[PDB]
Design a protein around this ligand. Sequence first.
Ligand SMILES: [Cu+2]
Ligand SMILES: [Cu+2]
Ligand SMILES: [Cu+2]
Ligand SMILES: [Cu+2]
Length: 507
Amino acid sequence: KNYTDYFFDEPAFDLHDGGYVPLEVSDAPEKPLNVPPLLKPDKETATDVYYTVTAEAGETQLLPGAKTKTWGYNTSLLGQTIVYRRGQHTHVTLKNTLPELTTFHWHGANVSGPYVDGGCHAPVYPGESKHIDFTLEQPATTLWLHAHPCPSTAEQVWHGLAAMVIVKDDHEASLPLPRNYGVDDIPVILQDRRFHENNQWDYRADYDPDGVAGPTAMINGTINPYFDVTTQKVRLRFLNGANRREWRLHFADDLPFTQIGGDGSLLPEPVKFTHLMLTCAERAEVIVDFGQYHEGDEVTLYTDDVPLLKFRIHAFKPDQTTLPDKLFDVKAPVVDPALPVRHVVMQGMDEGVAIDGKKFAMQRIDATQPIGKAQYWDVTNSNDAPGMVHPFHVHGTQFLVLSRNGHAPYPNEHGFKDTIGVNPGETVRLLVRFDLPGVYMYHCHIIEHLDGGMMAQIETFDPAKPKQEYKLMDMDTLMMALAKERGVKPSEIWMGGMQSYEKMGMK
Ligand SMILES: [Cu+2]
Ligand SMILES: [Cu+2]
Ligand SMILES: [Cu+2]
Ligand SMILES: [Cu+2]
């Protein structure tokens, strides 16, 4: 069964918005796709690994001309790919060499909150170093790292603070999958940007409370990239790292491809596609087979009508292996019947975005859930048609998708996920279990909605113990710091998201 059409509701696609910015094919000369190097551990044994992850500012040649000023992890733009291993004790030094405070959020990592999680409440101030330790007990998958100050996440991701995280385990290592990182297994971080004069980025001037989208696609920090294919089979780790844009991916000739992984795990079984849509923060790992091409051939990957990435076919050794019927055993957590079904409503667009009738307040806990107890969450997008698809994300968990409007989830949604696109009028039922105590956000992952208040937080707790005290960030602390850091008055700070709060008269 080859899936030839996008699963999401077509009327709600981003391309029907009034302020939709179409992608334009840039002038710049085609060049080799940048593949971020693997971050070298400071030290590694079988049981332990030590990393230093460093947020920093620099400049990057993106367009011919001047260099674009950028932020990155251990590099000028984006980051070096970080490798974690299930069961391995991980030690990370978070180092901020930026002019402003930041946060290090491990999107999709089953870690304690709110500090290791690295959300709103885990500031790392300029010049400061912080130490975190954790052991991941979750399946092999593609995660990512990104800035998460509340606000502005949108500004820091725009400036380039995102990096791929690969999680390895024993089960995945036993499978006949391409796995030579940089040769037949590559990141495909999908982003867009708007270049101004001097090829600079200017988030404020491009700002839009409903989502910032620029006309120039940028793949792993590359304009008009090509990839030299030297194997028959190639594994693409797609990440939608855009502020808002949806990617509607397909190849020339309707070349099929097989999705083998989603956000939080391998899919139970491989799923064949010709067309695949990804909302913000979603990952899809796919295998593309170039067996039916000759050397010299060129194969174009598209989003809608726009070429993104060209694959140049070189000589390759024939690959005889085929995927097994079942890739991964999904073990569903059990739900206590005594628990309520949690109902979470996403509402509004533009400056009016909200969850359950209110915007995020960094001091206010919106919900609680005992650890180790799975609960059904019904997540609804209140928008009426046309509306937009909101990608709903929950920190600190990987959930299963049980249903969409009482019917089957999409074909590629039978594994573990941390982000799900919710269509106008739709209720998605999720099975959500938190393994660790802490404070965790849940929010739309259109990053301007996130900053604009479409976010809430849940305290997970051990019932055996009393309520734990967490030092939560407050808005005065954040603005004091940004004021000092930017060398300006607390009253003349500008942050992405402020406009949403102020226009709605909310704090
Ligand atoms: Cu995220
Ligand atoms: Cu997250
Ligand atoms: Cu949203
Ligand atoms: Cu988040």
